[PDB]
Design a protein around this ligand. Structure first.
Ligand SMILES: CC(C)(C)NC(=O)[C@@H]1CN(Cc2cccnc2)CCN1C[C@@H](O)C[C@@H](Cc1ccccc1)C(=O)N[C@H]1c2ccccc2C[C@H]1O
Lengths: 99, 99
């Protein structure tokens, strides 16, 4: 689709077989999802944004459906304020900015 | 133009008589520019990122050119590691996400 930016660009995702709402975030290098049970192995990491750093669980090679499009890649899980789809997965679904 | 997401989507902006590099950020509600001595009145604000909140100065009706496209709107100034162009100004230049 073509998505305008008058409202937050929220989409439905499926991760670990569960549906969630997430923000398409071109300013995010990575994808970070709120705390959940997720099948796979993980390693601890820290990520930083406005306001500082948070501790997350890094899961690699996770299947995630984003607005009906498949991606398979790195998903961080931790105390993010909103679910965020970052560039690592937006590139996989072919998303670009246009103006 | 079209901007892919393999790398951070940085563009040149003009604000306050200065050229800067800034990130086109669909996840940002607001526009946040690194500390600079902009003239006139402002209002204190706090804004929340992934790691918590920071204190910024809110300036209204600030002219800013984004990749050659003029816009005018609210600009927040404060200690950010990156200049962020948020939705409030991206809408004004007709930016969309497409996939
Ligand atoms: C107005 C303001 C800019 C404060 N908004 C944000 O920070 C929002 C906050 N919401 C949350 C919110 C908070 C409070 C209220 N409403 C919403 C989550 C999404 N962010 C937008 C992010 O796109 C901002 C970028 C800024 C940044 C870019 C590069 C380097 C440093 C900072 C951001 O935090 N990006 C980081 C990021 C993000 C996710 C995963 C990994 C990484 C690394 C890094 O790329």
């Amino acid at each position: 689709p073509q998505i305008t930016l008058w409202k937050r660009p929220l989409v439905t995702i499926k991760i670990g077989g569960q549906l969630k709402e997430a923000l398409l975030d071109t300013g995010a290098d990575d994808t970070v999802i709120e705390e959940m049970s997720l099948p796979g192995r993980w390693k601890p990491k820290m990520i930083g944004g406005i306001g500082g750093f948070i501790k997350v669980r890094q899961y690699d090679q996770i299947i995630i459906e984003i607005a009906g499009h498949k991606a398979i890649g790195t998903v961080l899980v931790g105390p993010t304020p909103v679910n965020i789809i970052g560039r690592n997965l937006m590139t996989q679904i072919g998303a670009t900015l246009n103006f």
